[PDB]
Structure formats: C-alpha cells, structure tokens
Design a protein around this ligand. Sequence first.
Ligand SMILES: Nc1ncnc2c1ncn2[C@@H]1O[C@H](COP(=O)(O)OP(=O)(O)OC[C@H]2O[C@H](O)[C@H](O)[C@@H]2O)[C@@H](O)[C@H]1O
Ligand SMILES: Cn1cnc(C[C@H](N)C(=O)O)c1
Ligand SMILES: [Zn+2]
Length: 282
Amino acid sequence: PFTADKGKCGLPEIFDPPEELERKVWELARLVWQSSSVVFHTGAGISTASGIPDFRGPHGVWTMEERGLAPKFDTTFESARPTQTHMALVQLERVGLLRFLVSQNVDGLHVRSGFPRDKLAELHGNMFVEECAKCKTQYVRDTVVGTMGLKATGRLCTVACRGELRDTILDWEDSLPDRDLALADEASRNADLSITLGTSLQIRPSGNLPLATKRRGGRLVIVNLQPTKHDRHADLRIHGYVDEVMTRLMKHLGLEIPAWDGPRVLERALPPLPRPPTPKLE
Ligand SMILES: Nc1ncnc2c1ncn2[C@@H]1O[C@H](COP(=O)(O)OP(=O)(O)OC[C@H]2O[C@H](O)[C@H](O)[C@@H]2O)[C@@H](O)[C@H]1O
Ligand SMILES: Cn1cnc(C[C@H](N)C(=O)O)c1
Ligand SMILES: [Zn+2]
C-alpha cells in the first residue's frame, strides 16, 4: 500500500509536430484498414479530457502525491461524460473495426458510453459495478459503489440469493478477474493489430497484453503523450492528444463519432453496422 511501487511518474510529454502527426494517423488508418482483428487497450489518458486525472502524467494522482500535491478532478465520476475517444471506440465496435476493448480504467465511462460489455475487459474493475460473492451476478449502478478493494458495499443480491454485494476495485495485491484477463489475453494473442491509447503500460499483466499481439507477426501502435514501458516494441508511436488522434482517424475511416444519449448499459454487441468500402492501399 504505502510501499506499493507506483512506477515511473511525471516523465516529460512528447508532442509530434503537425506534419509527422498527420502522417502517423494516416499510417494508423492504413493499419486499421489492413487488419482483420483490431484490439484496443485503454488507460487513464483517455479520460483526462473529461476532467479525470491520470496516475503518472504531469498532474497524475501518483505524480502529484510524489510532489506532496493533490490530484485535481474537474468532474465527479457521476457527471463525467465519455470523451470523443470513448465515443469513437463505440462506433468502431459498431461498424465491426474493433474486435475487443481491454481497459485498466475503473472510471465506468466505457460501460456508460454504451460500449457492449461482452467486448469489454475491465481488468482493474469498475467503480459503478458491484458483484455478488455468492452468485457472481454484477450490478451496474448509476452512482459509484462506495467501497474499493473488493469490500462489502452494504447491499444484498436481489436475483430470483441475498448474497453480499462487493465492489470490483482491485487493491495492489489483488490478481485480475480471471474471466476478463482470459478474454483480454485471447483477444490480444489473436489480434493482428493492438492499438494502445493513454496507458503508460507499466502494470503487469495489463500493460503486457498488447505485446502478445506482436507474436505471430501482429502490429502494435502506441498512442501516448509520455513514453511507455514497451515503446521499443511499437511499429508506430503517436505522441499527441488521444482525441486529436481518434477524430483524425475517424475522418480518414469515413466514420462519424456518435452522440452520447447519457449513461446507458449494453450487455451484448450487435452484428456490425454498414461501414465505408476500404481504400486501395499498396
Ligand atoms: N489526452 C491524452 N492524450 C494522450 N495521452 C494522454 C492523455 N492524457 C494522458 N495521457 C497519457 O496517458 C498515460 C496514462 O498512464 P497512467 O497514468 O500510468 O495510467 P494507466 O491507465 O496506464 O495506469 C494503469 C494502472 O495504474 C494505476 O495504479 C491504476 O491501477 C491504473 O489502472 C500517461 O502516460 C499520459 O502521458
Ligand atoms: C492496478 N492493479 C491491481 N492489481 C493488478 C494486477 C497485479 N499486477 C497482479 O496480478 O497481482 C493491477
Ligand atoms: Zn447473488
């Protein structure tokens, strides 16, 4: 807890110049077009533009702690809106260009964005989600579950059980949920493209899952302002705000970023919606 290694914090930000940034996002568009199975890996950097601080950025939770300062929230978890990046990920799954989505984020924004829970692994848990110890039935609440560390919330199961509801928020020593890690690992291994967005990739095994794509000739794209553990293994590193990257990419793919209708929970993905025909590439 007090001793827990919080990794490299507050490393300097990298900004690709405008010409290099556009070339790289056109290369990312080329990679998504060519790839059969695209897996996205998200961390705290995809929520910074909705007022939720990350952990290891210049004003990260751990970075600020290291300097004896406090992280700053510009939102509650309840009033936080999915970013352009969150909504881009919704659309990419809908049109069948996203196979699976692996997130380290506990902020609940993927679920609340309307992203289908059967194509999502929430490796570190979800602050709005509590789970019955007896029957493992999960509840997606409209308010944050008041506890962290897999503790009793004080509510009981209502399945046709009265089992003790517990939060899904892993503490440092807790291993990943077997179901989410198993599906995330399978998805990453089989992927021919793994794209990382606002994660420094410093937490095992979460941060390592993109590397699994590299086995069998898979391609790895890392989008991050700061350096990441696995920068040297990337076929492409894009240093820029994830919203600028994802909005340019969606424009290149000929996709609109959909409207958020407010907080909505989707258990199961649908068959793909129509998508634009693919460019002639080579
Ligand atoms: N708008 C942005 N655009 C691009 N990159 C961004 C942006 N905002 C921040 N970043 C980058 O986003 C990156 C976020 O890196 P980290 O802060 O380590 O978050 P994690 O999700 O990988 O942390 C994993 C676990 O560690 C914790 O203990 C928890 O348990 C987490 O679940 C930084 O490098 C920023 O440069
Ligand atoms: C944030 N976090 C919590 N637990 C983890 C996984 C941890 N490295 C383990 O497997 O034991 C990450
Ligand atoms: Zn139950």
